[PDB]
Amino acid sequence: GKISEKTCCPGKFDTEDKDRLLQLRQRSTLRWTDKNPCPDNAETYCPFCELLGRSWRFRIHFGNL
RNA sequence: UUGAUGUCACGGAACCUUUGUUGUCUUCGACAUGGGUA
Numbered sequence: 435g436k437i438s439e440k441t442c443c444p445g446k447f448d449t450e451d452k453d454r455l456l457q458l459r460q461r462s463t464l465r466w467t468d469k470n471p472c473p474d475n476a477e478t479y480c481p482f483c484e485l486l487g488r489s490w491r492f493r494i495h496f497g498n499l
Numbered sequence: 500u501u502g503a504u505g506u507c508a509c510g511g512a513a514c515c516u517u518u519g520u521u522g523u524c525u526u527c528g529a530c531a532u533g534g535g536u537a
């Protein structure tokens with residue numbers, strides 16, 4: 435879970451409005467800590483939650499190839 | 500030409516069955532051609 439001096443929480447992969455999602459994850463998620471995910475109203479998010487884009491508005495946007 | 504907090508599709512052998520095989524003496528004789536003369 436270390437990345438530089440920071441440590442990543444488990445991320446969040448849990449959506450209440452399931453029917454929005456065309457696909458749902460069937461595989462298990464890899465684990466590295468017992469700690470809970472970052473709060474949904476936090477200001478500061480760990481690097482994994484930045485990569486997830488959880489921090490019309492994107493933080494990391496992938497274009498098509 | 501995607502939409503985003505969730506994609507094991509490297510998650511799936513074009514695989515399985517089917518005889519290029521059955522039948523046949525390297526033999527042997529009468530035939531071609533269209534008129535001619537009253």
Ligand SMILES: [Zn+2]
Binds near residue numbers: 444471472481482
């Ligand atoms: Zn986090």
